């Protein structure tokens, strides 16, 4: 009957598996039953009740010491956005850092009139980029250079427009008004059509490796094994030349050009998919049948979009545009909805990216701020100081040590033993200890050359690393802790800020 041989058989026996922790594989039917037909546990799940474990190896209970008040848990009473401590944002993925702020003005507030009493705001515009991918792309090419020269070059602007799907630029448009649905749909359709009429045939990436996430390890990913290969770069380049070999500088991406953004194709296809915005968001006249109704993203009648709701437009590679949304107010009551996800529409991703960070964007301040912030994750720092780096360009972490003022006393100054690090650089002691460290390193380089396709070369490099570590360690025990500090600062002030 109703696919009795097809909706049964446990959909290909549910031969797609997962992987939890210690290699245990579970079926998707089992996991779907766990989230669907196990609602008692879900009653606890939507109550944030604390339970606390017991120690299993203890004869007498003894509730295990936990600190569970994590950022998401404590933030459930806040409004708008959650709040973490940086380390918890480093965990739970959370790798899309903010690169720019903006606004979609109806009437732009003038500093004249009455302070700006004509300042009607339709949306608040924020742009977010994947910071590790921003580092890996814009940092190994545009890293260690003058940032003003980089942002002055029109090649950097072209590159941050081209590599936008690669960075996964997601734009959050938060409604600052009870906006009518038809007006917003017409405005977005008109703006995106205007930007589609100027989307010339331009450059897109091409795939260098297929597959990943086969239907047995849907929990797993291929990139850590790809980046921790026995030869890595050699293997990656070999894959590259067997398809699209990188022509650019140290960035990857082969960049096919022109035709990739076809005109009568995907551009016109997107000009039709935009026509199926006011017949997919505001269909035939019945404000209870319009898809976005009932949910908190609109009002009770569904006519207007409520103030505080946000629309998340993420530009995936291969022309994928993911439009999600999120209601406003208390985050403990916020509900997030996936609205649409289009794939293969290379004109939509390029048109949205041009509309946000183009030569004429929807907000020039947002485009300039995003293209200017992006060098901070490019230089291996992230937009917000999640790693608590003291040398951050903006929002640097402090050492937490009171600054010292030299007193006009004599009893405070004591001539103790060898318990001061060297602070005078360029002196005879520093120069002679640098010379002794130099001869120790030269002995290490000489000893690493006697340690005797690319996998055997990397094994030889590992053997040379072991011999160099042995010789350098013996030399550093011959020298002092000040020499250890000098080797540490020499290693620190020699690598590029990008981390290459």
């Amino acid at each position: 009957e109703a696919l009795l041989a097809l909706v049964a058989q446990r959909v290909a026996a549910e031969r797609m598996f997962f992987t939890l922790e210690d290699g245990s594989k579970v079926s998707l039917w089992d996991l779907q039953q766990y989230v669907d037909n196990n609602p008692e546990l879900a009653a606890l799940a939507a109550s944030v009740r604390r339970i606390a474990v017991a120690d299993p190896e203890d004869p007498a209970g003894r509730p295990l010491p936990g600190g569970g008040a994590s950022g998401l848990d404590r933030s459930r009473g806040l409004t708008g956005a959650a709040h973490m401590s940086g380390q918890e944002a480093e965990e739970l993925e959370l790798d899309w850092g903010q690169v720019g702020r903006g606004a979609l003005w109806r009437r732009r507030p003038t500093r004249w009139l009455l302070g700006g009493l004509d300042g009607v705001k339709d949306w608040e515009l924020e742009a977010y980029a994947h910071e590790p991918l921003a580092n890996q792309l814009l940092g190994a090419k545009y890293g260690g250079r003058d940032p003003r020269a980089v942002v002055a070059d029109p090649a950097y602007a072209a590159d941050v427009l081209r590599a936008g799907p690669l960075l996964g630029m997601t734009f959050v448009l938060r409604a600052a008004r009870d906006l009518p649905l038809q007006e917003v749909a017409s405005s977005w359709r008109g703006l995106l059509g205007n930007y589609l009429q100027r989307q010339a045939p331009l450059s897109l990436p091409k795939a260098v490796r297929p597959a990943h996430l086969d239907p047995t390890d849907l929990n797993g990913v291929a990139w850590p094994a790809l980046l921790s290969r026995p030869a890595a770069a050699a293997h990656a380049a070999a894959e590259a030349e067997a398809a699209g070999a990188v022509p650019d500088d140290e960035m990857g991406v082969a960049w096919r050009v022109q035709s990739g953004k076809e005109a009568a194709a995907s551009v016109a296809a997107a000009q039709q998919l935009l026509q199926s915005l006011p017949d997919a968001l505001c269909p035939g006249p019945s404000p209870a049948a319009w898809p976005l109704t009932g949910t908190k993203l609109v009002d009770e009648g569904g006519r207007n979009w409520r103030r505080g709701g946000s629309v998340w437009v993420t530009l995936q590679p291969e022309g994928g545009v993911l439009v999600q949304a999120q209601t406003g107010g208390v985050v403990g009551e916020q509900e997030s909805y996936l609205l649409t996800h289009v794939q293969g529409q290379e004109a939509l991703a390029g048109a949205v990216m041009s509309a946000f960070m183009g030569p004429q964007p929807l907000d020039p301040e947002l485009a300039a701020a995003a293209r200017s912030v992006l060098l901070v994750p490019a230089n291996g720092f992230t937009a917000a100081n999640k790693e608590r780096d003291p040398n951050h360009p903006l929002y640097p972490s402090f050492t937490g040590v009171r600054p010292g003022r030299a007193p006009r006393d004599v009893a405070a100054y004591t001539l103790a033993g060898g318990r001061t690090p060297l602070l005078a650089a360029g002196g005879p002691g520093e120069a002679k200890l640098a010379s002794e460290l130099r001869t120790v390193m030269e002995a290490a380089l000489a000893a690493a050359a006697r340690a005797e396709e690319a996998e055997a070369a990397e094994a030889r490099r590992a053997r040379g690393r072991a011999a160099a570590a042995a010789v350098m360690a013996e030399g550093l025990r011959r020298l002092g802790p000040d020499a250890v500090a000098m080797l540490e600062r020499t290693a620190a002030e020699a690598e590029a800020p990008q981390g290459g």
Binding site: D178, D299, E300, G301, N304
Partner: peptide, 21 residues
């Protein structure tokens, strides 16, 4: 007294703003 049954969803926000009462 009057029969003008106006409909608006911002009146809920106004009633919530009457928490000052």
């Amino acid at each position: 007294e009057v029969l003008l049954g106006q409909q608006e969803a911002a009146k809920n926000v106004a009633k919530q703003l009457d928490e000052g009462v």
